[PDB]
Structure formats: structure tokens, C-alpha cells
DNA-invertase (Enterobacteria phage Mu), 188 residues
Amino acid sequence: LIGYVRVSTNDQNTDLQRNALVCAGCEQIFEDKLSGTRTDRPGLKRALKRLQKGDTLVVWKLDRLGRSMKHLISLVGELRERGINFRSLTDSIDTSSPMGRFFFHVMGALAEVERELIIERTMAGLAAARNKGRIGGRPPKLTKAEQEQAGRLLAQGIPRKQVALIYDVALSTLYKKHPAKRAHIEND
DNA sequence: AAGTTTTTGATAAGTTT
DNA sequence: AAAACTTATCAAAAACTT
């Protein structure tokens, strides 16, 4: 019984989603913009607040919409959470009551596969690029010639809280050998 | 742009002469 | 034995790739 509208960037395809619900017999308007960084609902972010947690929702173009990347499915599954579903017209996407709900409930929950295998496709251009031509991981800032260097420092007269200063390693790295000073258990 | 695989690093898990 | 101290968990990372 609600109502929402999406903007792309031009006022050309705005009236397409605007008065698109002009007869949708809604009750509330929710215009917004994307001009900024669409990484934080750059428009009408409180529509989910003052919403009828009991009755259905309203929005129509899942096309031009914030709906993006892997997350577009992650949190959108909050409809089934409260008391709504969907049922626009531009895309008569089967929804509304259980007719669509439990018919497009395994379309967003099973939507895994839609890209769940891209977990392999993506690993293709990587598991291959690997082989012997560039692994693809944090580049070592410490050189092998400078690693074994301390192989005889603190073995002739060098302490601990001093061996590392010109190197400036870390606050957990350094020690990667035999014991040092009593007591155990990590944390970093 | 959703990933790895290495090789990394400031905060939180831990005693007894 | 209280917190010194060397740990083995937790992000961000610079390298890269679908």
C-alpha cells in the first residue's frame, strides 16, 4: 500500500518510473537521487523506517535501482522478514502472496547458483594466471637477504627490544623462531 | 569487481625468581 | 603470585582477475 520511484540520472527515464504508479493506487511517494555515491542509499533512505511493517511494500523497477552486486540479494531477503513481498508491473515478477513468494523465494535463496559457480569461473582466470606467472598476493617487503641476517644477532650479544628498530617490522611478526621469555598464549 | 595466496602487522590472550 | 613478555587469531594490504 506504499509507493516508491527510482531515478537514473536524466529526467528522461524518470517519468517512466514516476507516474508509472500514478494509478498504482498507492498511498505514499518516495522520490530520491543517485547523483552522489550509491554506496549509501543516496536518496530516500528512511522509506524502510516509516513503512507498514505489516502490509506489503511498493516499488517497481528492479532494473534501474540501487539493487546492485552480490548484496542486491543478500539483504533484499528482508521482505520475507517482515510483512511484504513485491508485485510491480514493469516486471510482473511473480510475487505478492505465496503465489510468487514461495515461487521466487527459491529464486533469491537459490539465486546462489546464478553466480555460485562464478566462484569457479573467477577462479579460472586466477588458478590459471597462477601457474608460474605471478601468484597474486601481498608483496614481501622483507627480503630473504635481510631475514637470515638476524640468524646470529641475538646469539652473540643483541637483546630483543633492540634488534628491531632500523628494520621496523611489526608488533607480532619479529619472533618466528624458538622460545624467548616465559609464559604463553597469543593475541594480535 | 567478488578473489585468492603469500607475507604481512597494531590490538587483545597469558606466566612466575 | 600482579602484568613484564611471545604468542598464535584478525583486518587491511598490494599483488591481481574473474
About this structure: Chain A has four helices and no strands. The helical segments of chain A are 71-74, 113-116, 118-130, 144-147.
